[PDB]
Amino acid sequence: QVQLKESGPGLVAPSQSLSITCTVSGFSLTNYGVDWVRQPPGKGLEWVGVIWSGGSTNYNSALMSRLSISKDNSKSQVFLKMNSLQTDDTAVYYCAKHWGGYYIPYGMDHWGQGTTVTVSSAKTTPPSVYPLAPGCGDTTGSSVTLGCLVKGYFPEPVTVTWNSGSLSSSVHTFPALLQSGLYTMSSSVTVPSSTWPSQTVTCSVAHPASSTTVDKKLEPR
């Protein structure tokens, strides 16, 4: 079973450097080549670079002098330094795998989930979970709606999980905006009224930038 994983620093300082490694499984880098794609915030896919299965690297013109795809065939890792960082260097850094024949890949086969990179002054401010439970005054019908307002984190991104993932039933995520120099997002999940407060609901927030995670349990009032 093939997997591609990426690790990173969440944030980094303006004008400094950054490397992101791509941990891989199910295949080999001797036999295969992996590209580096990225996605500026609110922008479109941006080819960063390539490393053919034979140590050879071809790069993105607009930054090859800031790029440098390395690899460790034995370690199945795909590192990627990147000197003199800048503020529009902010993107998601995916490691995709080659599906075409030999030296011309038919398409980027399997993509990692993506490591996020934020370039700014500000430092890692951890998040603050607060549950969004309904008052006692109002009531609901057949189904209920709850969530968590996860406030005050930096940098992006976070990731909530409802009822240990056994929830997926009407789960909405609302993007995070900045405020006081800090991000603030919220998650809502709708569940049958026969289940809440009936059964034990809970919201679990991941945020690798500070790595910390808080799972909240919901009680009215």
Partner: protein
């Protein structure tokens, strides 16, 4: 150093109606082996990007027949018919014939469906957090169409806009609806001196406003 143009930048369309994306290259995307390396990729919201079409007209596994990719040299088109909510996401063309390989600027597929009314719920600030100098009354409005809505916070009669922040969603991939979150945060202080709180909200669905207020009693 090869250019690829993608138009339109966004494409409204309805479930069951056909779609077409023409990708334009500034030059030849044909290889010396006569094989022109043009891919289409889709990125649903939240999800990672995915290969759909891998050689102009060659569908990739999973991807159903409703997706079509035609093209010669400058002109390539992705046509997707019998359009689902799942079709949502950004579609990108990618050329791999000569280096450096490049992407189109993507086109946002837009679906037009049946008007759906919004579901509002107001949630009063949290115990713990209230004990944190702060007080936030976060409302919710879920599963609506069109994306056009209006929401205001009253605090004993008047309206609140000061610093207020609402957050929307991209159209759902299952019901193709939008949702939005508004927060009304201030200080405990001020929360400590207003009793009831209203989550007003108007929409194309209801001639009457959608309200979700709550007292501090």
């Amino acid at each position: 150093e090869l250019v690829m143009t993608q138009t339109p930048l966004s494409l409204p369309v309805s479930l069951g109606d056909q779609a077409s994306i023409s990708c334009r290259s500034s030059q030849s995307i044909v290889h010396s082996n006569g094989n022109t390396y043009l891919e289409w990729y889709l990125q649903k919201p939240g999800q990672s990007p995915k290969l759909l079409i891998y050689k102009v007209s060659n569908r990739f596994s999973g991807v159903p027949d409703r997706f079509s990719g035609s093209g010669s040299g400058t002109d390539f088109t992705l046509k997707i018919n019998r359009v689902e909510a799942e079709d949502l996401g950004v579609y990108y063309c990618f050329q791999g014939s000569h280096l450096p390989p490049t992407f189109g600027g993507g086109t946002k597929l837009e679906i037009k469906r049946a008007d759906a009314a919004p579901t509002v719920s107001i949630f009063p600030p949290s115990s713990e957090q209230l004990t944190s100098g702060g007080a936030s009354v976060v409302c919710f409005l879920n599963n609506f169409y069109p994306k056009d809505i209006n929401v205001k916070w009253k605090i004993d009669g008047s309206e609140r806009q000061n610093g207020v922040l609402n957050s929307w969603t991209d159209q759902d991939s299952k019901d193709s609806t939008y949702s939005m979150s508004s927060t009304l945060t201030l200080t405990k202080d001020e929360y400590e001196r207003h009793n009831s709180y209203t989550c007003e909200a108007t929409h194309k669905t209801s001639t009457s406003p959608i309200v979700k207020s709550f007292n501090r009693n």
